Amino acid sequence: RAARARESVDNLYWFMLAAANSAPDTPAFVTRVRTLSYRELRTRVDDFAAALAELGLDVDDRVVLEANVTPDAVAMLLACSLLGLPFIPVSPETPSGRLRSILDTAEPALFAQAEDGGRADVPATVGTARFGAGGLRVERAPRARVRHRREIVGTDTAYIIFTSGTTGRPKGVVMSHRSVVSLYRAILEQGLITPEDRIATTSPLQFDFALFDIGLALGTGAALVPVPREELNWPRRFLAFLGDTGATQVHGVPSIWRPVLRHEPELLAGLDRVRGILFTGEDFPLPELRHLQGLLPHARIVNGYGATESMACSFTEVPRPIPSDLERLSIGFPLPGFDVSLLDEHGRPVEEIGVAGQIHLRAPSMFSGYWDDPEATARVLVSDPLDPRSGRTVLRSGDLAYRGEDGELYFAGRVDAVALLHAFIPLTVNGKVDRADLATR
């Protein structure tokens, strides 16, 4: 009786598990060294979907998935996907006060955590479950409800990413199945990755960088290599992990390299299997970037630029070697089927090389809105200033950029705007500079 996305409708289930039909016995995950096959992953998703369907949740009903990137956590989000149940990924590190704030806003039907999970006292108004290879064990069944939705569509919400927005307000980026799949399709077209690759992923699941890495790898028929968040503090254990698992690509915010470059630059030079590194989140300090390049000279580095509101925007290979005169890394060209206007303060095109204007993004991968915040949505998703009467929307990015002589882009910071407004690093759960931490001094 539960609704299920059809094979022909944009949906993470069908997008990520297509490799179960071409190459069922190929590795989807590498853990520690154990592989999990595409077929094994599909069975786990189908088992979780069968248990989830029993609960009587309507399409658009929200499941909080509290977990790090694990084979089980991905099986759960793909089982939420097939049933049109939007997943809200939460890091176990998240303090209980912030979870309870997301539970109050998002009003989910169910909170799901790993079998060995430590979260207690989730409110009585929300259902609770635990997942493992054992299956999905319900602790408290979700409320009785009448199912109103007959059919799952590609514009249905896949996931909501919750952060504290720039005011106090909880920021919930609502992303449709069709928006995410569109990003995955665009980046597959680039051909960064092959089925023979093993993607070491470092981001927490509540960061769409993790959602990028999962989709990129499974979409391609490659293997995902979740790096346990613990091993990242311990540079020798981190390099040992990448070596032992045969990781060919390492994805993470710039932060993940700082401990390794200070304490174990000799051992990093020893990872001969690594063909590629990908980063996003913030500027890669150029001294650390030139150091990292020097230590793995046969490894392509990709600068990934974009926001949660579109998942991503551009992927530019860092010049090898980095020019000795280079001021700034290029964020290159938007992906095929993506487009940027640089507009001045009045929304007029900037058409001078070297002059910064606000990025306005046209993309197939656009968010649907900010959870319960239509004012904020109307200030970010706006009438295209180059076509204001059509009703077409663009993303008013709040990011500045300028163009070089071949039309490539350069990030020039926030229009809101380590130095602060003083000169100084404490990291956010996502691996960013905790600028709010440093500003309290």
Ligand X SMILES: Nc1ncnc2c1ncn2[C@@H]1O[C@H](COS(=O)(=O)NC(=O)C[C@H](N)c2ccccc2)[C@@H](O)[C@H]1O
Could you list the residues known to form a binding site for ADP, using ranges. Answer: 280-281, 283, 303-304, 308, 399
- By CB under 6 A, name the one of 66, 156, 208, 264 that touches ligand X: 208
User: DSSP letters of 294-305?
Assistant: HHSTTSEEEEEE
What are phi and psi for residue 304, nearest 5 degrees? -95, 120
428 interface partner picked from ligand X, its own copies, Ca ion, none, CB below 5 to 8 A per type: none
Confirm or reject binding of residue 282 to ligand X (CB under 6 A): yes
Binding region for Ca(2+): 60, 386
**285 vs 337, which CB is nearer to its own copies?**
337
- Cα Rg, the chain, nearest whole Å: 21
Using CB under 6 A, which residues numbered 299 to 358 contact ligand X? 303-308, 311-312, 331
- By CB under 6 A, name the one of 226, 281, 334, 431 that touches ligand X: 281
183 interface partner picked from Ca ion, ligand X, its own copies, none, CB below 5 to 8 A per type: none
**48 vs 305, which CB is nearer to ligand X?**
305
- Shortest gap between Cβ of 32 and its own copies (angstroms)? 36
Using CB under 8 A, which residues numbered 385 to 404 contact its own copies? 386-387, 389-393
Residue 291: which of 249, 313, 262, 328 has the closest Cα? 262
- By CB under 8 A, name the one of 1, 97, 120, 148 that touches its own copies: 148
Using CB under 5 A, which residues numbered 57 to 86 contact Ca ion? 58, 60
Taking residue 99's Cβ as centre, other Cβ atoms within 10 Å add up to 21
- Shortest gap between Cβ of 145 and ligand X (angstroms)? 31
**283 vs 384, which CB is nearer to Ca ion?**
384
Region near its own copies per CB under 8 A, out of 40-48, 154-162, 275-283, 294-302: 154-162
Q: What does the binding site for its own copies look like in residue numbers (CB under 8 A)?
A: 6, 8-10, 58, 60, 86, 146, 148-157, 160, 174, 176, 178, 182, 185-186, 189, 333-334, 336-341, 349, 351, 362-364, 366-372, 374, 377, 383-384, 386-387, 389-393, 407
Residues forming contacts to Ca ion in the complex (CB under 5 A) are: 58, 60, 386-387
